[PDB]
PDB file of C-alpha atoms in Angstrom:
ATOM      1  CA  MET A 165       6.660  50.407   3.407  1.00  9.40           C
ATOM      2  CA  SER A 166       7.948  46.318   3.696  1.00 12.23           C
ATOM      3  CA  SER A 167       4.391  44.779   3.855  1.00 13.59           C
ATOM      4  CA  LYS A 168       3.464  46.424   0.574  1.00 16.44           C
ATOM      5  CA  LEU A 169       6.602  46.117  -0.690  1.00 17.30           C
ATOM      6  CA  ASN A 170       6.024  42.491  -1.959  1.00 14.59           C
ATOM      7  CA  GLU A 171       2.749  43.532  -3.830  1.00 15.86           C
ATOM      8  CA  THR A 172       3.936  46.430  -5.308  1.00 16.09           C
ATOM      9  CA  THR A 173       7.237  44.703  -6.772  1.00 16.81           C
ATOM     10  CA  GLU A 174       4.967  42.112  -8.382  1.00 22.26           C
ATOM     11  CA  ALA A 175       3.067  44.477  -9.785  1.00 23.30           C
ATOM     12  CA  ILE A 176       6.093  45.870 -11.042  1.00 24.08           C
ATOM     13  CA  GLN A 177       6.733  43.132 -12.681  1.00 24.45           C
ATOM     14  CA  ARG A 178       3.807  42.535 -14.232  1.00 19.90           C
ATOM     15  CA  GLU A 179       3.386  46.000 -15.865  1.00 19.30           C
ATOM     16  CA  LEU A 180       7.080  45.546 -17.245  1.00 20.03           C
ATOM     17  CA  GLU A 181       5.405  42.731 -19.136  1.00 21.33           C
ATOM     18  CA  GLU A 182       2.680  44.928 -20.387  1.00 21.38           C
ATOM     19  CA  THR A 183       5.253  47.618 -21.437  1.00 19.15           C
ATOM     20  CA  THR A 184       7.351  45.175 -23.070  1.00 18.83           C
ATOM     21  CA  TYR A 185       3.755  43.381 -24.826  1.00 18.86           C
ATOM     22  CA  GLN A 186       2.867  47.228 -26.386  1.00 19.40           C
ATOM     23  CA  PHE A 187       6.466  47.532 -27.329  1.00 17.68           C
ATOM     24  CA  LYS A 188       6.312  44.154 -28.994  1.00 22.10           C
ATOM     25  CA  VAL A 189       2.805  44.254 -31.002  1.00 24.61           C
ATOM     26  CA  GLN A 190       3.160  48.207 -31.616  1.00 25.18           C
ATOM     27  CA  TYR A 191       6.886  48.475 -32.675  1.00 24.29           C
ATOM     28  CA  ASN A 192       7.919  45.184 -33.255  1.00 24.84           C
ATOM     29  CA  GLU A 193      10.700  45.813 -30.684  1.00 28.08           C
ATOM     30  CA  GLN A 194      12.702  47.565 -32.796  1.00 28.46           C
ATOM     31  CA  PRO A 195      15.535  49.760 -30.958  1.00 27.06           C
ATOM     32  CA  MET A 196      15.630  53.465 -31.008  1.00 24.31           C
ATOM     33  CA  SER A 197      18.331  56.016 -30.140  1.00 24.05           C
ATOM     34  CA  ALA A 198      17.831  59.762 -31.823  1.00 22.41           C
ATOM     35  CA  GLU A 199      21.247  59.143 -33.109  1.00 22.66           C
ATOM     36  CA  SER A 200      19.951  56.352 -35.477  1.00 22.13           C
ATOM     37  CA  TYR A 201      16.714  58.401 -36.622  1.00 19.05           C
ATOM     38  CA  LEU A 202      19.004  61.434 -37.215  1.00 19.22           C
ATOM     39  CA  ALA A 203      21.660  59.245 -39.319  1.00 22.15           C
ATOM     40  CA  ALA A 204      18.834  57.427 -41.073  1.00 20.02           C
ATOM     41  CA  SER A 205      16.713  60.515 -41.995  1.00 19.98           C
ATOM     42  CA  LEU A 206      20.255  61.901 -43.346  1.00 19.44           C
ATOM     43  CA  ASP A 207      20.884  59.349 -45.413  1.00 20.60           C
ATOM     44  CA  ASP A 208      17.274  59.285 -46.881  1.00 18.39           C
ATOM     45  CA  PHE A 209      18.011  62.719 -47.423  1.00 20.86           C
ATOM     46  CA  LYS A 210      20.938  61.845 -49.425  1.00 24.17           C
ATOM     47  CA  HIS A 211      19.588  59.552 -51.204  1.00 21.61           C
ATOM     48  CA  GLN A 212      17.090  62.030 -53.014  1.00 21.68           C
ATOM     49  CA  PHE A 213      19.913  64.669 -53.123  1.00 23.19           C
ATOM     50  CA  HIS A 214      22.035  61.941 -55.506  1.00 29.35           C
TER      51      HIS A 214
ATOM     52  CA  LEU B  84      -2.779  12.700 -54.442  1.00 31.68           C
ATOM     53  CA  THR B  85      -5.022   9.605 -52.493  1.00 32.06           C
ATOM     54  CA  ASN B  86      -2.197   7.254 -53.190  1.00 30.15           C
ATOM     55  CA  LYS B  87       0.606   9.567 -51.382  1.00 30.97           C
ATOM     56  CA  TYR B  88       2.235   6.552 -49.987  1.00 25.56           C
ATOM     57  CA  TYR B  89       2.851   5.130 -53.140  1.00 27.16           C
ATOM     58  CA  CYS B  90       4.586   8.694 -55.131  1.00 29.55           C
ATOM     59  CA  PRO B  91       6.519   9.580 -51.976  1.00 29.51           C
ATOM     60  CA  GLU B  92       8.879  12.144 -54.691  1.00 30.15           C
ATOM     61  CA  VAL B  93       5.707  14.511 -55.590  1.00 32.65           C
ATOM     62  CA  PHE B  94       4.215  14.770 -51.935  1.00 32.86           C
ATOM     63  CA  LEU B  95       7.485  15.703 -50.840  1.00 29.67           C
ATOM     64  CA  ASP B  96       7.592  18.357 -53.299  1.00 27.41           C
ATOM     65  CA  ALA B  97       4.399  19.501 -52.628  1.00 22.37           C
ATOM     66  CA  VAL B  98       5.121  20.003 -48.505  1.00 21.84           C
ATOM     67  CA  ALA B  99       8.746  21.681 -49.270  1.00 18.66           C
ATOM     68  CA  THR B 100       7.201  24.208 -51.738  1.00 16.50           C
ATOM     69  CA  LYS B 101       4.538  25.414 -49.441  1.00 17.10           C
ATOM     70  CA  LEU B 102       6.983  24.987 -46.569  1.00 18.02           C
ATOM     71  CA  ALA B 103       9.543  27.460 -48.760  1.00 19.03           C
ATOM     72  CA  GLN B 104       6.908  30.253 -49.575  1.00 18.93           C
ATOM     73  CA  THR B 105       5.539  30.621 -46.254  1.00 16.42           C
ATOM     74  CA  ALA B 106       9.079  30.764 -44.814  1.00 17.37           C
ATOM     75  CA  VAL B 107       9.733  33.367 -47.216  1.00 16.73           C
ATOM     76  CA  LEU B 108       7.491  35.826 -46.178  1.00 12.60           C
ATOM     77  CA  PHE B 109       8.598  35.743 -42.537  1.00 12.06           C
ATOM     78  CA  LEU B 110      11.629  36.290 -43.968  1.00 11.03           C
ATOM     79  CA  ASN B 111      11.184  38.956 -46.100  1.00 12.29           C
ATOM     80  CA  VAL B 112       9.856  41.377 -43.480  1.00 13.28           C
ATOM     81  CA  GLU B 113      12.268  40.202 -39.987  1.00 12.87           C
ATOM     82  CA  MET B 114      15.304  39.360 -41.412  1.00 11.26           C
ATOM     83  CA  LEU B 115      15.709  41.220 -44.716  1.00 12.94           C
ATOM     84  CA  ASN B 116      14.378  44.275 -43.621  1.00 13.33           C
ATOM     85  CA  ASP B 117      16.119  44.420 -40.431  1.00 14.78           C
ATOM     86  CA  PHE B 118      19.342  44.515 -42.517  1.00 12.18           C
ATOM     87  CA  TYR B 119      17.973  47.012 -44.580  1.00 14.28           C
ATOM     88  CA  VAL B 120      17.830  49.567 -41.734  1.00 15.36           C
ATOM     89  CA  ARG B 121      21.094  48.535 -39.609  1.00 12.63           C
ATOM     90  CA  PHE B 122      23.272  47.669 -42.043  1.00 13.58           C
ATOM     91  CA  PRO B 123      24.136  51.562 -43.118  1.00 14.36           C
ATOM     92  CA  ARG B 124      24.309  52.299 -39.071  1.00 11.99           C
ATOM     93  CA  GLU B 125      26.549  49.674 -38.358  1.00 12.87           C
ATOM     94  CA  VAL B 126      29.256  50.146 -41.483  1.00 13.75           C
ATOM     95  CA  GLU B 127      29.324  54.311 -40.020  1.00 14.77           C
ATOM     96  CA  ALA B 128      30.552  53.515 -36.763  1.00 16.73           C
ATOM     97  CA  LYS B 129      32.381  50.676 -37.158  1.00 17.88           C
ATOM     98  CA  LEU B 130      34.113  52.449 -39.817  1.00 19.38           C
ATOM     99  CA  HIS B 131      34.329  55.624 -37.774  1.00 17.83           C
ATOM    100  CA  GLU B 132      35.940  53.176 -34.913  1.00 15.74           C
ATOM    101  CA  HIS B 133      38.387  52.116 -37.230  1.00 17.86           C
TER     102      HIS B 133
ATOM    103  CA  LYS C 247      32.162  46.996 -58.052  1.00 18.68           C
ATOM    104  CA  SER C 248      31.908  49.519 -55.232  1.00 17.47           C
ATOM    105  CA  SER C 249      34.103  52.569 -54.555  1.00 12.25           C
ATOM    106  CA  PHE C 250      36.055  50.089 -52.135  1.00 13.42           C
ATOM    107  CA  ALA C 251      37.851  47.677 -54.597  1.00 14.43           C
ATOM    108  CA  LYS C 252      41.041  48.777 -52.749  1.00 14.75           C
ATOM    109  CA  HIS C 253      41.817  49.721 -49.311  1.00 15.31           C
ATOM    110  CA  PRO C 254      40.905  45.927 -48.239  1.00 13.16           C
ATOM    111  CA  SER C 255      41.079  46.644 -44.710  1.00 11.17           C
ATOM    112  CA  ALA C 256      37.737  49.021 -44.698  1.00 10.17           C
ATOM    113  CA  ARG C 257      36.686  46.503 -47.280  1.00 10.04           C
ATOM    114  CA  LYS C 258      36.834  43.954 -44.869  1.00 11.62           C
ATOM    115  CA  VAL C 259      35.211  46.220 -41.899  1.00  9.88           C
ATOM    116  CA  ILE C 260      32.212  46.750 -44.085  1.00 11.17           C
ATOM    117  CA  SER C 261      31.933  42.834 -45.139  1.00  9.63           C
ATOM    118  CA  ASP C 262      32.315  41.727 -41.111  1.00  7.74           C
ATOM    119  CA  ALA C 263      29.915  44.365 -40.188  1.00  8.49           C
ATOM    120  CA  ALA C 264      27.197  43.360 -42.791  1.00  8.41           C
ATOM    121  CA  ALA C 265      28.007  39.960 -41.307  1.00  6.75           C
ATOM    122  CA  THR C 266      27.234  40.593 -37.913  1.00  6.66           C
ATOM    123  CA  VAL C 267      24.062  42.146 -38.543  1.00  6.90           C
ATOM    124  CA  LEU C 268      22.865  39.189 -40.338  1.00  3.52           C
ATOM    125  CA  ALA C 269      24.163  36.984 -37.028  1.00  2.00           C
ATOM    126  CA  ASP C 270      22.369  39.343 -35.091  1.00  3.39           C
ATOM    127  CA  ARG C 271      18.961  38.502 -36.703  1.00  3.05           C
ATOM    128  CA  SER C 272      19.858  35.032 -37.680  1.00  3.20           C
ATOM    129  CA  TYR C 273      17.805  32.995 -34.877  1.00  3.94           C
ATOM    130  CA  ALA C 274      15.217  35.603 -34.322  1.00  6.09           C
ATOM    131  CA  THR C 275      14.138  34.427 -37.845  1.00  6.37           C
ATOM    132  CA  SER C 276      14.795  31.071 -37.812  1.00  7.65           C
ATOM    133  CA  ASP C 277      12.594  30.447 -34.240  1.00  7.21           C
ATOM    134  CA  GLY C 278       9.559  32.985 -35.978  1.00  7.78           C
ATOM    135  CA  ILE C 279       9.875  30.290 -39.159  1.00  5.44           C
ATOM    136  CA  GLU C 280       9.524  27.246 -37.276  1.00  6.09           C
ATOM    137  CA  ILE C 281       6.531  28.852 -34.959  1.00  9.34           C
ATOM    138  CA  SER C 282       4.998  30.328 -38.350  1.00  8.53           C
ATOM    139  CA  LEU C 283       5.534  26.815 -39.690  1.00  6.70           C
ATOM    140  CA  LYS C 284       4.040  25.061 -36.641  1.00  2.11           C
ATOM    141  CA  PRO C 285       0.522  24.659 -38.324  1.00  2.00           C
ATOM    142  CA  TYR C 286       2.228  22.939 -41.187  1.00  3.63           C
ATOM    143  CA  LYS C 287       4.180  20.243 -38.746  1.00  3.99           C
ATOM    144  CA  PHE C 288       1.026  18.978 -37.878  1.00  2.17           C
ATOM    145  CA  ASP C 289      -0.890  18.800 -40.732  1.00  3.72           C
ATOM    146  CA  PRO C 290       0.323  20.036 -44.047  1.00  8.23           C
ATOM    147  CA  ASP C 291      -2.483  18.992 -45.942  1.00  6.37           C
ATOM    148  CA  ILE C 292      -1.721  18.975 -49.911  1.00  3.20           C
ATOM    149  CA  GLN C 293      -4.312  20.380 -52.203  1.00  4.45           C
ATOM    150  CA  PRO C 294      -4.614  18.708 -55.736  1.00  8.64           C
ATOM    151  CA  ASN C 295      -3.533  21.697 -57.488  1.00  6.46           C
ATOM    152  CA  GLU C 296      -0.455  21.713 -55.065  1.00  6.98           C
TER     153      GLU C 296
ATOM    154  CA  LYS D  62     -27.433  19.091 -21.231  1.00  6.88           C
ATOM    155  CA  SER D  63     -25.649  16.802 -19.393  1.00  8.88           C
ATOM    156  CA  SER D  64     -26.294  14.287 -16.686  1.00  7.24           C
ATOM    157  CA  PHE D  65     -23.933  17.021 -14.404  1.00  8.73           C
ATOM    158  CA  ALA D  66     -27.250  19.256 -14.440  1.00  9.96           C
ATOM    159  CA  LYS D  67     -27.304  18.508 -10.668  1.00 13.83           C
ATOM    160  CA  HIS D  68     -24.215  18.783  -8.249  1.00 16.35           C
ATOM    161  CA  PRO D  69     -23.202  21.851  -9.097  1.00 18.12           C
ATOM    162  CA  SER D  70     -19.879  21.412  -7.358  1.00 16.16           C
ATOM    163  CA  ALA D  71     -19.159  18.851  -9.869  1.00 12.14           C
ATOM    164  CA  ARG D  72     -19.996  20.566 -12.666  1.00 11.39           C
ATOM    165  CA  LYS D  73     -17.948  23.465 -11.453  1.00 11.44           C
ATOM    166  CA  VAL D  74     -14.872  21.493 -11.276  1.00 14.02           C
ATOM    167  CA  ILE D  75     -15.417  20.296 -15.220  1.00 13.72           C
ATOM    168  CA  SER D  76     -16.436  23.997 -16.217  1.00 13.42           C
ATOM    169  CA  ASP D  77     -13.182  25.073 -14.210  1.00 13.20           C
ATOM    170  CA  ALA D  78     -11.026  22.035 -15.963  1.00 16.19           C
ATOM    171  CA  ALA D  79     -11.945  23.699 -19.091  1.00 19.34           C
ATOM    172  CA  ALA D  80     -11.072  27.373 -17.570  1.00 19.25           C
ATOM    173  CA  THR D  81      -7.764  26.223 -16.409  1.00 22.04           C
ATOM    174  CA  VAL D  82      -6.422  24.399 -19.426  1.00 22.06           C
ATOM    175  CA  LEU D  83      -7.202  27.385 -21.921  1.00 24.57           C
ATOM    176  CA  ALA D  84      -5.919  29.667 -19.705  1.00 24.98           C
ATOM    177  CA  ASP D  85      -3.054  27.476 -19.501  1.00 24.89           C
ATOM    178  CA  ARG D  86      -2.596  27.306 -23.775  1.00 23.56           C
ATOM    179  CA  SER D  87      -4.042  31.106 -23.998  1.00 27.57           C
ATOM    180  CA  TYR D  88      -0.905  32.876 -23.961  1.00 24.23           C
ATOM    181  CA  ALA D  89       1.552  30.658 -26.379  1.00 25.48           C
ATOM    182  CA  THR D  90      -1.129  30.739 -28.925  1.00 24.75           C
ATOM    183  CA  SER D  91      -1.702  34.433 -28.191  1.00 26.27           C
ATOM    184  CA  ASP D  92       2.402  35.079 -29.115  1.00 27.94           C
ATOM    185  CA  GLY D  93       2.328  32.533 -31.715  1.00 27.10           C
ATOM    186  CA  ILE D  94      -0.790  34.289 -33.733  1.00 28.57           C
ATOM    187  CA  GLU D  95       1.390  37.894 -33.382  1.00 31.93           C
ATOM    188  CA  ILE D  96       4.652  36.639 -34.205  1.00 29.22           C
ATOM    189  CA  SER D  97       2.799  34.540 -37.478  1.00 34.18           C
ATOM    190  CA  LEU D  98       0.672  37.738 -37.802  1.00 34.59           C
ATOM    191  CA  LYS D  99       4.294  39.928 -37.938  1.00 37.18           C
ATOM    192  CA  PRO D 100       4.788  39.755 -41.932  1.00 41.20           C
ATOM    193  CA  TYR D 101       1.415  40.816 -42.621  1.00 41.40           C
ATOM    194  CA  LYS D 102       0.601  43.608 -39.972  1.00 41.67           C
ATOM    195  CA  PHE D 103       3.828  44.999 -42.727  1.00 38.03           C
ATOM    196  CA  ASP D 104       2.387  44.697 -45.774  1.00 40.65           C
ATOM    197  CA  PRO D 105      -0.665  42.960 -45.610  1.00 43.75           C
ATOM    198  CA  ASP D 106      -0.868  43.209 -49.670  1.00 44.86           C
ATOM    199  CA  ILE D 107      -4.273  42.690 -51.209  1.00 47.64           C
ATOM    200  CA  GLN D 108      -4.471  40.676 -54.331  1.00 47.50           C
ATOM    201  CA  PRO D 109      -7.283  41.433 -56.759  1.00 48.66           C
ATOM    202  CA  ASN D 110      -9.403  38.542 -55.475  1.00 47.95           C
ATOM    203  CA  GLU D 111      -9.003  38.937 -52.154  1.00 46.22           C
TER     204      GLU D 111
END
């Protein structure tokens, strides 16, 4: 395990790189939470109701 | 336009208009749209906390 | 013009919220604009119509 | 077509030099291109001439 630890660590850093890349190209790095989604959709509905 | 060094005014204004327009595109997407999305959430959170 | 004409404290909370969002996006907007301008920094070639 | 048709080692050195330069610059070009395209990902508004 200790031997494989270094190579695994470097590979994990890389896939952290690629996950970050997909986060950049497809969602433009927009942070998201459930509460933000709910609040935004509620305001959309309130504008429609207005 | 070939005597650009004889007419600095018009040359500098052409550069200014071009830079202004493409900067305007990137600005409108990034800053303006992020403001339209993040502003209400920040209002709600900060008002509630106050 | 809004309903928050009175209540200067809450009004300042709103204004400061807008200010903090704009401040958060300011740098990313600026740097992105510089990157988009990188080709016109090298050769801002001017067309006769421009 | 060059004089390095023979000497495949020297030829490989030249080829690898080109490859390592392009590889060094590749990331900055890609990321810069995605950032510059960020406004057209959102609204690739099509003009009648386009």
